[PDB]
Amino acid sequence: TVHIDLSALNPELVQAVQHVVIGPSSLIVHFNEVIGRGHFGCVYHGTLLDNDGKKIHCAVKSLNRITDIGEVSQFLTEGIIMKDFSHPNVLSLLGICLRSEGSPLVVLPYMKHGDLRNFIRNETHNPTVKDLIGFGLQVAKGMKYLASKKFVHRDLAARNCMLDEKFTVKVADFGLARDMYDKEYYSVHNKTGAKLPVKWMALESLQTQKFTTKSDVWSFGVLLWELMTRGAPPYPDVNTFDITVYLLQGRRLLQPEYCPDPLYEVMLKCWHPKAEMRPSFSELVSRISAIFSTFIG
Template sequence: MIWAEFSDSLKWFFGAIRRSDAEKQLLYSKNKTGAFLIRESESQKGEFSLSVLDGGVVKHYRIRRLDEGGFFLTRRITFSTLNEFVSHYTKTSDGLCVKLGKPCLKIQVPAPFDLSYKTVDQWEIDRNSIQLLKRLGSGQFGEVWEGLWNNTTPVAVKTLKPGSMDPRDFLREAQIMKNLRHPKLIQLYAVCTLEDPIYIITELMRHGSLQEYLQSDAGSKIHLTQQVDIAAQVASGMAYLESRNYIHRDLAARNVLVGEHNIYKVADFGLARVFKVDNEDIYESKHEIKLPVKWTAPEAIRTNKFSIKSDVWSFGILLYEIITYGKMPYSGMTGAQVIQMLAQNYRLPQPSNCPQQFYNIMLECWNAEPKERPTFETLHWKLEDYFETDSSYSDANNFIR
């Protein structure tokens, strides 16, 4: 491994953490100006990034590697090891925003209690073991509740309207879903299917759907940095599904959930093919397959054939939702009108508050040719490195460009 030279004693080395997670760590109240960490670059394999706290703002620098080994920010001065690099910049800022101080303090975000190990051989749990406490939201398929399992464990409970799915179809899909485990995917714990309403029990995300959050007072206060972070977290979960050859089929803000500590996770993956839906925003094809047309790729509308590339199209629509604070895409247009416009190569226009760089990513997702759309892995690193400073130096003044 490229970091084999590092020992556990190097408190400043944080390994493969995300840019946004580095910021959260550095902005922890006990860190002071000059606090820093070094992390692996996701987009540039074999390279590293330096993240530094400067008066309440986190700044990032790309640490480049020499062909013959060693590291540098500017070719004016190079280092054989990262230890030497850190030693130098703790003595002088030498062009950095500040001189490096103490290594960043590590804080741990608590992981949700996972009861799935208790239900690994018993999918179906006793309905009486679930207590519904507070309704978090509702939709076309039913309601979502905050609940308690066995009077001890907080969980989320999705209650499905009678007739919204065939329990046998769902259980087949759930068997696959339970084996998909990633920090940016909602973990499925257990089910209650022996009577209506069907219960789907998952980890709890207290702030509800991303769609509702974006439209709320709290959501209206976020800005581009947080919006890009949301998109990057969703792309991370989707990149995992991509690596497992699994398709979501209904990626949208309504199917992303918001938890504590600015955590966002993809939910309801796989359920689209077992739901029996009936809604005016759903397009019903001649094969009687119903689609959320405003989020669905044109080729999936035409042929009913879904792929990870049709999920990428939907991700582009999700980016539109994020940047517009939950605005309905193709507002004022019916599903039939959207289909007609897409056939004429129409695309959602650039929102007034949307940077060109962000809109370009959306347009890549909406390439008419599915094969030309980016992978979720590519989308993930593009969003992770969206604000990454290119640490080229001006030798004249040693400031970052």
């Protein structure tokens, strides 16, 4: 039971939400089929009805246990941010349900193969080295696009990239994760306080808490490493409190077994201690494209 005063929301926000509102008899939420639980609420399988009558399989993200109007606001703006991107390697929005009674909803296209991290860890799938380089390239393209819209991601990692039925990677800001044998996704970050994924963070972000596109580039480097190790945890035998010093000493993730030398060289350029010396996403797309092009497998 939720009653929301719509008049207490920013009116421009409400108007933006109206441009992507979902029809009254188009969405079915399968409460029986949970995808995950977060601090915000639940994510369900759902079935949206096309402007024609067609049945679209989607993921319904629902806001539950609401305590204040600011929480509704943030939920809705996150939704609106992703409405104004349009790129095959960035996860798109199907719609939003905002009513004065009941949980607000954000509806997303269903991603057949879930998150990229569980996919590359899954032993039934045998993604080849070339494939993994392919996935890293599609990610670079998504970040290249987002960096062109001056959007800073802050939480790039394999767990936040989804993978669709055509094996297209959609960069996303899911915030949830799951284990190999878990049926359901759960929250990665704490309910309150800053989102700090230490082992994906740039040296300067660890020190100053300031995130930039150039720090997304670092996280990408780490994301590449995940791909080439098929989802190994980074710096496993290092405590999250010692990471900073470890980096300051000049140590870096080591070359994974079947990772090509020039791709590992890309990862290092991503981890350059000076941000402005790291490559842009545009340069990464070109470098990794060249590598992919000349790779045999």
